[PDB]
Amino acid sequence: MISLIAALAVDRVIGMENAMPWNLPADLAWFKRNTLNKPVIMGRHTWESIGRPLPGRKNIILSSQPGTDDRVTWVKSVDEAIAACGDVPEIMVIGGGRVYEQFLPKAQKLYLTHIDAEVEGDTHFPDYEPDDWESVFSEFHDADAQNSHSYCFEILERR
Numbered sequence: 001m002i003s004l005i006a007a008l009a010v011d012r013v014i015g016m017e018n019a020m021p022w023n024l025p026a027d028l029a030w031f032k033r034n035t036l037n038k039p040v041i042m043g044r045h046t047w048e049s050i051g052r053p054l055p056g057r058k059n060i061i062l063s064s065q066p067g068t069d070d071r072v073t074w075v076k077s078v079d080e081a082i083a084a085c086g087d088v089p090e091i092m093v094i095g096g097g098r099v100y101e102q103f104l105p106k107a108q109k110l111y112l113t114h115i116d117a118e119v120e121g122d123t124h125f126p127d128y129e130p131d132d133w134e135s136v137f138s139e140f141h142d143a144d145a146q147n148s149h150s151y152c153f154e155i156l157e158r159r
């Protein structure tokens with residue numbers, strides 16, 4: 001099974017200048033809980049944005065060019081990325097925009113955080129078709145001393 005996980009600001013913005021400008025510790029904790037002990041697939045730009053391997057996960061990087069770091073696994077196509085995960089119950093695709101576009105048609109589940117924040121961005125999560133997806137979990141949180149925007153964790157499953 002393939003799943004996508006992402007955090008979206010208003011208008012589906014996910015990034016600006018190869019960074020995420022906000023800081024929501026509760027959402028990063030959610031990301032860790034839902035990805036630990038699973039393989040994670042990311043594009044090369046997202047690898048550069050994170051800047052180090054994510055511990056406790058098999059890190060798989062898509063790039064058309066040879067890899068430059070043997071602490072992670074480098075692959076050259078979507079089918080190779082999936083194969084490099086092996087026989088696991090759930091593969092997590094962690095972006096960025098170009099990678100989400102390619103894996104969305106193959107995904108059964110979306111883990112989305114909706115952040116109440118207006119961000120000028122240059123990268124968006126794909127337009128997906130709402131009729132294709134059932135919401136099976138949602139949990140709203142107001143802003144607090146650690147998280148400066150309200151946010152909503154949602155899990156969607158392909159109908």
Ligand SMILES: NC(=O)c1ccc[n+]([C@@H]2O[C@H](COP(=O)([O-])OP(=O)(O)OC[C@H]3O[C@@H](n4cnc5c(N)ncnc54)[C@H](OP(=O)(O)O)[C@@H]3O)[C@@H](O)[C@H]2O)c1
Pocket residue numbers: 005006007008013014015016017018019020042043044045046047049062063064065075076077078094095096097098099100102123
């Ligand atoms: N809010 C969130 O949830 C979230 C999550 C992830 C990322 N982001 C943000 O998203 C942005 C990065 O997204 P992006 O769309 O620019 O880049 P991306 O999807 O991370 O990386 C694209 C790169 O991946 C490689 N690639 C993608 N598909 C491939 C394929 N089928 N075969 C081979 N290589 C392939 C290419 O590398 P080469 O050029 O080396 O061939 C391509 O240039 C940043 O702002 C980041 O902060 C946000």
Ligand SMILES: Nc1nc(=O)c2nc(CNc3ccc(C(=O)N[C@@H](CCC(=O)O)C(=O)O)cc3)cnc2[nH]1
Pocket residue numbers: 005006007020027028029030031032046049050054055094095112113
């Ligand atoms: N829900 C969600 N939120 C995000 O912010 C997110 N970000 C990315 C891409 N960017 C990043 C940037 C940093 C870390 C990161 O350092 N995660 C740590 C959390 C511990 C911490 O530094 O607070 C990790 O071990 O997973 C992960 C993804 C991909 N999917 C996401 N999915």
Ligand SMILES: [Mn+2]
Pocket residue numbers: 077079
């Ligand atoms: Mn092929």
Ligand SMILES: [Mn+2]
Pocket residue numbers: 086087
């Ligand atoms: Mn197999």
Ligand SMILES: [Mn+2]
Pocket residue numbers: 116117118148149150
């Ligand atoms: Mn806000």
